[PDB]
Amino acid sequence: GRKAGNLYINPKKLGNLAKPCMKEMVSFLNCMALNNIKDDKCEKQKQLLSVCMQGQSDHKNKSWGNINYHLQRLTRG
Amino acid sequence: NLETNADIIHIKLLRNNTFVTVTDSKGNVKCKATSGSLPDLKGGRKMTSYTADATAENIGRRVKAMGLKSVVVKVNGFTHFKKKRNAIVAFRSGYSNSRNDQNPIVYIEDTTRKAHNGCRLPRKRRV
Amino acid sequence: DSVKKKRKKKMNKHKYRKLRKKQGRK
Amino acid sequence: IRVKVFSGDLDKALTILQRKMQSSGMERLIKAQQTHHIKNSEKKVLARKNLERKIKSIDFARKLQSILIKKVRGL
Amino acid sequence: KAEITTEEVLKKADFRNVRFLAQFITEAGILVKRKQTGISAKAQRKIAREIKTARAFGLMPFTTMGTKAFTFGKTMENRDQDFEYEVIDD
RNA sequence: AAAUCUACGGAUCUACGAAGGAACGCCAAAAGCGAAGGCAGCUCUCUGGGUCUCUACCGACGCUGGUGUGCGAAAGCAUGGGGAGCGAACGGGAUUAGAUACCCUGGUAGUCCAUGCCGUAAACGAUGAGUGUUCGCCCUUGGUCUAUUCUGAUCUGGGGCUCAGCUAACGCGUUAAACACUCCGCCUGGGGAGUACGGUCGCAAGACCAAAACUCAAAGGAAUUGACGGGGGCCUGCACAAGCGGUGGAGC
Ligand SMILES: [K+]
Ligand SMILES: [K+]
Ligand SMILES: [K+]
Ligand SMILES: [Mg+2]
Ligand SMILES: [Mg+2]
Ligand SMILES: [Mg+2]
Ligand SMILES: [Mg+2]
Ligand SMILES: [Mg+2]
Ligand SMILES: [Mg+2]
Ligand SMILES: [Mg+2]
Ligand SMILES: [Mg+2]
Ligand SMILES: [Mg+2]
Ligand SMILES: [Mg+2]
Ligand SMILES: [Mg+2]
Ligand SMILES: [Mg+2]
Ligand SMILES: [Mg+2]
Ligand SMILES: [Mg+2]
Ligand SMILES: [Mg+2]
Ligand SMILES: [Mg+2]
Ligand SMILES: [Mg+2]
Ligand SMILES: [Mg+2]
Ligand SMILES: [Mg+2]
Secondary structure, three states, rough: OOOOOOOOOOOOOOOOOOOOOHHHHHHHHHHHHOOOOOOOHHHHHHHHHHHHHHHHHHHOOOOOOHHHHHHHHHHHH | OOOOOEEEEEEEEEEOOEEEEOOOOOOEEEEEEOOOOOOOOOOOOOOOOEEEEHHHHHEEEEHHHOOOOOEEEEEEEEOOOOHHHHHHHHHHHHOOOOOOOOOEEEEEEEOOOOOOOOOOOOOOOOO | HHHHHHHHHHHHHHHHHHHHHOOOOO | OEOOOOOHHHHHHHHHHHHHHHHOHHHHHHHOOOOOOOHHHHHHHHHHHHHHHHHHHHHHHHHHHHHHHHHOOOO | OOOOOOOHHHHHHHOHHHHHHHHHOOOOOEEOOOOOOOOOHHHHHHHHHHHHHHHHOOOOOOOOOOOOOOOOOOOOOOOOOOOOOOOOOO
């Protein structure tokens, strides 16, 4: 594993391996399964799936990862 | 204006199959559903969360179709609470199409019991 | 006494028990 | 553990049920349920590994809290 | 928190004082640990033994999963008034 | 991944009731007790040991200990019961080149109780029992004294860290692998070998004591530098993913 020493805080020891709009996609496919694969009469699910991609365009690759510098510097000082 | 005998939804979430059963207040079964008895799932795997919340969806639609308005949800299983919470909200999804219609659920309960060192469990699997 | 030294004793004991069960059945 | 839902707010009832299953300790025991049989000679090994992990976490939290409380209270 | 002392526990702890012993069970019906009351090990041993004796005698629940929560003085029956609800909201 | 198995004679699921066997969740553990093996639901009976206090008694009555005697996980053996769950042997279904195995499904002996036998374990702290001395710090089990409301002191066992000291190194460190001593057991290069022969014990399985011929010049312990891992973490490559055109087919 990683070399044990000082203080280290993992950038992935939280919920971040979660690529969004999985649940929206499976509800959209549930509509197709119920309504024998027809895009009609559940256009609200299609609107939800498209506003997923608009919000995915809004969000970018984000995390907070400068924590370890602060921990190391303040532990030394 | 308080009534007494609400229907009961039991949701046992085992490891390889989830059972949802709709009973009255004295225990008489009115309808039931399992993972393997769904019309679309065709073999292969059954322990994933999709089989559980699909069974909850199916029972929710079937309970809406028989005109019930007052249910009490009892959940049983040796799993994390996230899966029980997801199964309950999937049942609400089955009853109400857009999460807009009023909640028929009037009570939620967890009925999961542990053996007090009873029988001896089977051996490990050297896979 | 390491495992590499215990394995020689293991094999010798296994062979002796096998021969005892064979020859001692008379 | 039974929780009554008021005014049709299912999310508040589910959060209350989750927190009560947490604080009653039943969630720890419902996760500690075993699928197979473990002998006492393996229960000892698992308890020892648990103890070592706990000691490491105690040292980490002690040092983190000390360096927090040095800075935060006017120093 | 609720203040309990080892001397208080050592004077009150008995399987007939179910009202006092009900401080030391959770909503799941299981026994509270020592570290969240601060009493000594002798006090914890006495509390656990008396709660076990009361459970065998029938005055306290073994477990409360599938049943209502245990408070002193009222019945543990599963009557029709356990699940009273409202209909005027619909 | 499946199949055997089981189910329309109505299974799984749901409520109530009945039977029977084994183990005692939470408390709960670097806790406690025991010479060691070991000992976990609760109430009573009988009993072994231990700790603290005393301006109490007695007066070296002590330590170790060959030959001997007693206790001694588990499996196993004999007689009589019991049998839920698990499960050697064995039947079947899969996997594979084969699979007398790993995986799945049934399941006898056994695991349990009463009375006896055997007397072995990585029975391990891989550290025999005992006595005296050696700088401290932080926790904790059970007491006693003093308190000045929150603490100090002194015994008793259990743990963590360490000055010295010791150690081939790893490490030990007031519960020593430190500074010394008393008594017991054991070792004298590897293989052959805990094997052969003999005696004692056992209903058996086997246990205890325990060689030689021959053969080799090594067999080893700890750590270092590389390499490797169907062990892990962080990266990265027309290697893959997304496309486009070929080669293997024809003639030259
Ligand atoms: K003693
Ligand atoms: K003696
Ligand atoms: K040390
Ligand atoms: Mg040796
Ligand atoms: Mg002891
Ligand atoms: Mg036995
Ligand atoms: Mg018999
Ligand atoms: Mg098997
Ligand atoms: Mg076979
Ligand atoms: Mg079986
Ligand atoms: Mg031996
Ligand atoms: Mg042992
Ligand atoms: Mg001795
Ligand atoms: Mg003390
Ligand atoms: Mg001490
Ligand atoms: Mg030194
Ligand atoms: Mg000493
Ligand atoms: Mg030495
Ligand atoms: Mg031998
Ligand atoms: Mg002989
Ligand atoms: Mg490609
Ligand atoms: Mg060609």
